[PDB]
């Protein structure tokens, strides 16, 4: 026999990051023994807010330097432009980025 229409749990919460894949990365990562049904929902949302907030800021730096695609320099520069995004990734190197443009305003020429 057949069964009902399989509605994915990512579409039942209005998210884009999956909840089926997150819920088997809380029971095969030995984080705890029981994982609630609402926990990979709530975690796939916080993975989805923070994935926007970089790419929101990574979209602007691509636009301000006339680019269609976002190369890692923009991800390097979207981070450390925002203050609170930088304090999350304060220890973290991003590959192929270089640094922000910075002079200490004492080395200016005389």
């Amino acid at each position: 026999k057949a069964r009902a229409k399989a509605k994915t749990r990512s579409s039942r919460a209005g998210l884009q990051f999956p909840v089926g894949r997150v819920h088997r990365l809380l029971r095969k990562g030995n984080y705890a023994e029981r994982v609630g049904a609402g926990a990979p929902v709530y975690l796939a949302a916080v993975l989805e807010y923070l994935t926007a907030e970089i790419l929101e800021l990574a979209g602007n730096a691509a636009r301000d330097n006339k680019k269609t695609r976002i190369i890692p320099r923009h991800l390097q520069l979207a981070i450390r432009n925002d203050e609170e995004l930088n304090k999350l990734l304060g220890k973290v190197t991003i590959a192929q980025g270089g640094v922000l443009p910075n002079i200490q305003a004492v080395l200016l020429p005389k």
């Binding site: 026999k1 057949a2 069964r3 009902a4």
Partner: protein
């Protein structure tokens, strides 16, 4: 306009028939009578109730929530088989409290007698059932095995073992535990024997399972007056309080006495069919019950048409999914106001 002995009432136009009732129906989503008394405050016209029934057949927000007030009819008592090893009624019990790493107990009741068989396992998988019956198919081979539509029995693997033995698998109608008859009774026996033994101690019930298929299998059926041993074998084994009344006979001739013992047994009584019974009709609209109804959800699905009627208790309906889901008539409801 019209005059009534309770006041002045209003005759609406013929174009205003469906609109005036539908706005009174959806005020509280009532059925036939509380709908009608709303219209009995402003309006009145000949054949009010032919229009209220015209509403509710289209109002598919009210067909899938109200339940039937029409019970199903008389229950069927199917006959006993004429030999043992013809119908086994199997159903896991448990999760019980644990002992020796066991939680689930397969219970194989013979449909001839009541002779239970126990085969405890760790988890109700397919393969835990298959080795549990290879002990029991060592005794003899059944024709038919009844069950419920279990998680382990409906597997495509379990049926491929069952076709080897000559097992005719039989499954109950879904969400109908009343179909599996004797096994739901002996599970109220096993949990009234193991309950009585285990009073005042830790439930170490894996010790007491060789007791149960020897203590229940020598309980006299108090309305048949025989052991399960005698109706299965013919004479008692070396048990306490065993009959010597058969030792005055020849075993070479009481085999055919035993076939006349088996055909004189008590048959149960069908209850009288109550007044608000209802019968399925091929072509009548019926509604199944939603399987596991979530909170604040329809209890019933959308209407469906009966394809075939098998007995007056088992009917094949055509679900919204396109499903030939062979349900009982303790599942269905008569679709209101056809």
């Amino acid at each position: 306009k019209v005059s009534r002995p309770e006041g002045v009432k209003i005759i609406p136009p013929q174009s205003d028939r469906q609109k005036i009732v539908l706005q009174a129906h959806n005020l509280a989503h009532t059925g036939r009578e509380a709908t009608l008394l709303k219209i009995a405050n402003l309006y009145w016209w000949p054949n009010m109730r032919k229009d209220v029934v015209k509403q509710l057949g289209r109002c598919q927000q009210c067909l899938i929530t109200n339940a039937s007030n029409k019970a199903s009819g008389p229950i069927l008592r199917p006959d006993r088989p004429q030999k043992p090893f013809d119908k086994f009624f199997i159903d896991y019990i448990g999760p019980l409290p644990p002992s020796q790493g066991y939680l689930y107990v397969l219970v194989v009741v013979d449909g001839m007698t009541g002779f239970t068989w126990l085969y405890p396992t760790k988890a109700p998988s397919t393969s835990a059932t298959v080795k549990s019956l290879n002990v029991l198919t060592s005794i003899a081979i059944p024709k038919v095995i009844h069950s419920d539509q279990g998680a382990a029995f409906t597997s495509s693997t379990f049926a491929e073992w069952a076709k080897e033995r000559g097992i005719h698998l039989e499954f109950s109608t879904p969400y109908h535990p009343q179909s599996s008859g004797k096994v739901e009774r002996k599970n109220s026996d096993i949990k009234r024997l193991l309950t009585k033994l285990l009073v005042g101690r830790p439930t170490k019930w894996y010790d007491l399972l060789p007791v149960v298929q020897l203590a229940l299998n020598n309980t006299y059926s108090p309305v048949l007056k025989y052991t399960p041993h005698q109706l299965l074998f013919g004479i008692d084994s070396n048990t306490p309080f065993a009959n010597q009344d058969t030792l005055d006979l020849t075993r070479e001739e009481e085999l055919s006495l035993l076939q006349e013992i088996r055909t004189s047994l008590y048959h149960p009584s069908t209850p009288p069919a109550s007044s608000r019974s209802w019968s399925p009709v091929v072509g009548q609209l019926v509604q199944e019950r939603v399987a596991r109804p979530a909170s604040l959800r329809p209890r019933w699905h959308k209407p469906s048409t009966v394809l075939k009627v098998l007995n007056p208790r088992t009917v094949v309906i055509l679900d919204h999914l396109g499903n030939n889901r062979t349900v009982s008539i303790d599942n269905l409801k008569p679709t209101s106001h056809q």
